[PDB]
Design an enzyme around this catalytic site. Structure first.
Site: not given
Ligand SMILES: *CC(=O)Nc1sc(-c2ccccc2)cc1C(=O)NC1CC1
Lengths: 305, 301
Positions: A41, A143, A145
């Protein structure tokens, strides 16, 4: 003596964390040999995330559309490809800090350590279990991820988790390192919800054994039960069925403490029906379910890495 | 979202852990530049547990009596000295993995990460606090001595604890990295008892502010309290007194949530009276006292 929620030492994984940027999205990647792994993503904008076509969005990207930073050096991306929900960015340099490692998929009830990072910079480590509903009760801010979950056995890191998203109830969803989601979740900005959770029965029993080994004995009683009697009680309080595999795995703890698993089940039956009557176990008023049998044996015997 | 007891990443500390042996005693040491720090009781035999005379035991040792092992490598000891309760072994290799670090002495209520180690090998990392009675509720088997506690703020490791002993109640006593014990304890096997353990009030308040930030308001009430009336109630539940310092320190979390410190004190007063009534706050059925104001600002922003 004592009993603590204990993460694996994170040093072998710290050496693999990098920053990955695609346009205005920054998140964390895992750098092993000459590949950086991160959530696919990362190639999406806010608009794309509503209903993404990944094979489509990826085809438009050149190698130089991916800025990979390891500390304060630049890695050159020489290749890109998807495996399920993870983006693999091939880089010109093998990570010299690459540890011995494998990608493994864990089962619900299994625990692991998470290295929370921000902008490729590790900020904390905590111990998690894969819930029966395939979420994790994590602590992530924007942040996080691409932060990963791992176990260590001898010198070998077993990577089992990569963080992709938060659900509306505050819990977290992600993939194994081959990009397969844990649970019925997709990497799209859509309405998704954690299913009904249940309690990991074998882990609660493991933690009751940890309590006994540390001298916390008040919940022991003279009674025993059977799997079927116990499982009817478990189902009623939203506990996972206890199977014969579970009894077998608790075997060593049953032998070290003199308390047979169906003996300890009779204790857990009584805590479920009556509560703790003002008492605590290992300083907790709730039944702790995020320690496996292996975790209890490892911490109560001092295995190192 | 979420709220977890988070430890610091342990990698910078792992690269400093070695094994120190003297006679038949093996424990952990901390290798920074060309010095290995470990508990001085590494030089004791079982004859020496009650009334060791460290100066007399130490003057009988040579450098070569101290085996220091960093992974598979043996390090050569070229000097030794004692500072309070830590032994400092000078070695002929600076540790290439030495991080940016400092030694700091912490106050009761402060949190830090422990890297639990056996034979100079890290087993695990956990988060704990210095209890008001100067002990820590750790997880430490035999051979864990010389394991260290630390904070990492930016790239700098602040070493604040070295583990020396287990007290009869299963709680842990140790020193700063200048070898001064926390609390009234000594490195002797005589009867020493932990003072009564109290709850760290400033920490519980910080954690209640954490629960509001993460969107939980069920335990707030319409009342306020004076500082002194709060302290008169809280001490009846074995809570540490809250000071004007603690009230100043909670200022940012107050401003952020729009709940005055003394209004949150009124909530804690009612929580102590009522218990939870089958509810939980950030996933706990007890009041958590091992997160500091600073940790809450860190983990909730
Ligand atoms: C941390 C702790 O309990 N201290 C240790 S570890 C230890 C030992 C002995 C033989 C093999 C491996 C480890 C000895 C002690 C201890 O408490 N006594 C030392 C003699 C002073």
């Amino acid at each position: 003596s004592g009993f603590r929620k204990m993460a694996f030492p994170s040093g072998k994984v710290e050496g693999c964390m990098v920053q990955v940027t695609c346009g205005t999205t920054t998140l964390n990647g895992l750098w092993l040999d000459d590949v950086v792994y991160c959530p696919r993503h990362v190639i999406c904008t806010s608009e794309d995330m509503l209903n993404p076509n990944y094979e489509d969005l990826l085809i438009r990207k050149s190698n130089h559309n991916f800025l990979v930073q390891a500390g304060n050096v630049q890695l050159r991306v020489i290749g890109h490809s998807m495996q399920n929900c993870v983006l693999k960015l091939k880089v010109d340099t093998a990570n010299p800090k690459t540890p011995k490692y494998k990608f493994v998929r864990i089962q619900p009830g299994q625990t692991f350590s998470v290295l929370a990072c921000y902008n490729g910079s590790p900020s904390g480590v905590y111990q998690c279990a894969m819930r029966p509903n395939f979420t994790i009760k994590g602590s992530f801010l924007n942040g996080s991820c691409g932060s990963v979950g791992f176990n260590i056995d001898y010198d070998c890191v077993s990577f089992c988790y990569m963080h992709h998203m938060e659900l509306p109830t505050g819990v977290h969803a992600g993939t194994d390192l081959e990009g397969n989601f844990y649970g019925p979740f997709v990497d799209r900005q859509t309405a998704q919800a954690a299913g009904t959770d249940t309690t990991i029965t074998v882990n609660v029993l493991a933690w009751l054994y940890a309590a006994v080994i540390n001298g916390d004995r008040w919940f022991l009683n003279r009674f025993t039960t059977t799997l079927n009697d116990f499982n009817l009680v478990a189902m009623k309080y939203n506990y996972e069925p206890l199977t014969q595999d579970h009894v077998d795995i608790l075997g060593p703890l049953s032998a070290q403490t003199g308390i047979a698993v169906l003996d300890m089940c009779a204790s857990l039956k009584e805590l479920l029906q009556n509560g703790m009557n003002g008492r605590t176990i290992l300083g907790s008023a709730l039944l702790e379910d995020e320690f496996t049998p292996f975790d209890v044996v490892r911490q109560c015997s001092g295995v190192t890495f």
